[PDB]
């Protein structure tokens, strides 16, 4: 009775990894604090063939590093359990990244009634790698910690450095930006990291709304940015997009 | 740190001010934890059943 709970208490690290390998069926991501402690992860960070600021960087981000590393079971016996922990190795570090959010943009004019209302399909993460931009279209391969962006180049596309002209022009003659088109006006809001883009065209009525001051703005026929420190909700037609994270009551 | 610009010419907001860490390769590590064995029978049978079920996965 005491020895079974002693077996539980000495082997906390061993029963949890067998459970975590059963549930994920051999291949486990993200790696846990049972699969690898912080001291062992730090001593392994000091071991990798990388420069010193890379080691400091993975020491400051020991949560995102765990969220990018797999751990594949290799050999299990009655008294030994073995698994390869595939810790990430970053090739380049400390080069500027940026996340591109887009929104529908109708070329509204009442002179003729000819609107085409583009949208850019190349939203996602971009980083500088080797003098050329490495672009990540998936929203799951890149993880952010408050100034830092961590991606992977497994299936990442590699675009030239002249894709920044995609931010101010679609038909710029230096890169062909990914664009889908329409033929009638559409209206939706795209919440961003530090704000929200609101496109309001046609007969749609979109009103911004501060948390305390009520309606403070009425969007015209046009695409307008609005910060997450100036408004709190945006109503487009009947959809109430929430620009900020709505605070709620706590629990105990 | 993060500055988010907005370009109304394409209706896109760009969140600049980040610093990269682009994964390029792997770093394997063979971690081998040994069983803290015990000489109660049902717990050992449960652990050996788990070990057998994980062995048949390969």
């Amino acid at each position, epitope marked *: 009775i005491e020895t079974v709970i002693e077996f539980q208490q000495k082997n906390n690290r061993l029963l949890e990894i067998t459970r975590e390998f059963s549930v994920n069926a051999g291949v486990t991501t993200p790696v846990s604090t049972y699969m690898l402690t912080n001291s062992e992860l730090l001593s392994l960070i000091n071991d990798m063939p990388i420069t010193n600021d890379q080691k400091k960087l993975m020491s400051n981000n020991v949560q995102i590093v765990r969220q990018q590393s797999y751990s594949i079971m290799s050999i299990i016996k009655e008294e030994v359990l073995a698994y390869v922990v595939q810790l990430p190795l970053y090739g380049v570090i400390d080069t500027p990244c940026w996340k591109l959010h887009t929104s529908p943009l109708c*070329t509204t004019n009442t002179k003729e009634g*000819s609107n085409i209302c583009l949208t850019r399909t190349d939203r996602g993460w971009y980083c500088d790698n080797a003098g050329s931009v490495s672009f990540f279209p998936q929203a799951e391969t890149c993880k952010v910690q408050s100034n830092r962006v961590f991606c992977d180049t497994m299936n990442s596309l590699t675009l030239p450095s002249e894709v*920044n*002209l995609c931010n*101010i022009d679609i038909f710029n003659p230096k890169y062909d930006c990914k664009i889908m088109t329409s033929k009638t006006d559409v209206s939706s809001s795209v919440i961003t990291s530090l704000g929200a883009i609101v496109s309001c065209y046609g007969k749609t009525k979109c009103t911004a709304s501060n948390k305390n001051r009520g309606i403070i703005k009425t969007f015209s026929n046009g695409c307008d940015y609005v910060s997450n420190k100036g408004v709190d909700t945006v109503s487009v037609g009947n959809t109430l997009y929430y620009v900020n994270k709505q605070e709620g009551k706590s629990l105990y | 740190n993060i500055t988010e610009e907005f370009y109304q010419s394409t209706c896109s907001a760009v969140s600049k001010g980040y610093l990269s860490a682009l994964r390029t390769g792997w770093y394997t590590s063979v971690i081998t934890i040994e069983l803290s064995n015990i000489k109660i029978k049902q717990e050992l049978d449960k652990y050996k059943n788990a070990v057998t079920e994980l062995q048949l996965l390969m």
Partner: antibody, heavy 120, light 111 residues
Framework: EVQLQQSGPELVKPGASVKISCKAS????????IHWVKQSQGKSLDWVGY????????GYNLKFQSKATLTVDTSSTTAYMELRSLTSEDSAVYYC?????????????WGQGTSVTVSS | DIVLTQSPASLAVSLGQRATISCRAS??????????INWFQQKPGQPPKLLIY???NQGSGVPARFSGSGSGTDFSLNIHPMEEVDTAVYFC?????????FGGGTKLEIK
């Protein structure tokens, strides 16, 4: 409103690299593209090149690549045109265009026109 | 290189009538359904000024007498009614891809 000043007419000896300055006041300089258009003496509006001042990105028509070097100064909101190895065929007028793109309203308002007279 | 042919060369239109100018592109300048043709007007001693953009729309502060029409490889600029102040050279500029090409331009002096 949006206005584009340009440098005065220059009278230059051949073979000298000259600089045309186009000052833009009244809009956001990192949202448009200052195109350069050369009109000769009584002919059409021959295109020269483009500069997007958001990145300083330059491109050319493929008969002005060995002739023009188009630069920006985004802090002074100014476009510059460096003309190298000038001949009698470059005595013309040059225009800077604000050139809203992306399902365009293209070339809204223009510069007043720099007249470069190249002769001995 | 999308070369554009603009017709005619010199256009004589009576005071108070309809004047049309054709611009035939050699390739399709349409991009995702809408054309990229801009019609400019240049008085002598003056920079060219936008009149028509997108081959249909009207520029900021342009009276309705100027109108764009057409699609594909054929476009038309229509000026009606005609005044004494609208004497200039007009240009049809393509905007699809590099290099951008300007038409030869029509000089309309009043008949």
């Amino acid at each position: 409103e949006v206005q584009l000043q340009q440098s005065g007419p220059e009278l230059v000896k051949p073979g000298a690299s000259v600089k045309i300055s186009c000052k833009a006041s009244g809009f956001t300089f990192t949202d448009f593209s200052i195109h350069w258009v050369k009109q000769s003496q009584g002919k059409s509006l021959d295109w020269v090149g483009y500069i997007y001042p958001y990145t300083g990105g330059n491109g050319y028509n493929l008969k002005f690549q060995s002739k023009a070097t188009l630069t920006v100064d985004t802090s002074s909101t100014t476009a510059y045109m460096e003309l190298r190895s000038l001949t009698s065929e470059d005595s013309a007028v040059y225009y800077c265009a604000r050139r809203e793109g992306n399902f365009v309203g293209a070339m809204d308002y223009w510069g007043q026109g720099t007249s470069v007279t190249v002769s001995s | 290189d999308i070369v554009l042919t603009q017709s005619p060369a010199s256009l004589a239109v009576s005071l108070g009538q309809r004047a049309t100018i054709s611009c035939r592109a050699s390739e399709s300048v349409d991009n995702f359904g809408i054309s990229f043709i801009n019609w400019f007007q240049q008085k002598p001693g003056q920079p060219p000024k936008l009149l028509i953009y997108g081959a249909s729309n009207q520029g900021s502060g342009v009276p309705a007498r100027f109108s764009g029409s057409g699609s594909g490889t054929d476009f038309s600029l229509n000026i009606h009614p005609m005044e004494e102040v609208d004497t200039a050279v007009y240009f049809c500029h393509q905007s699809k891809e590099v290099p951008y090409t300007f038409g030869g331009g029509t000089k309309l002096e009043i008949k």
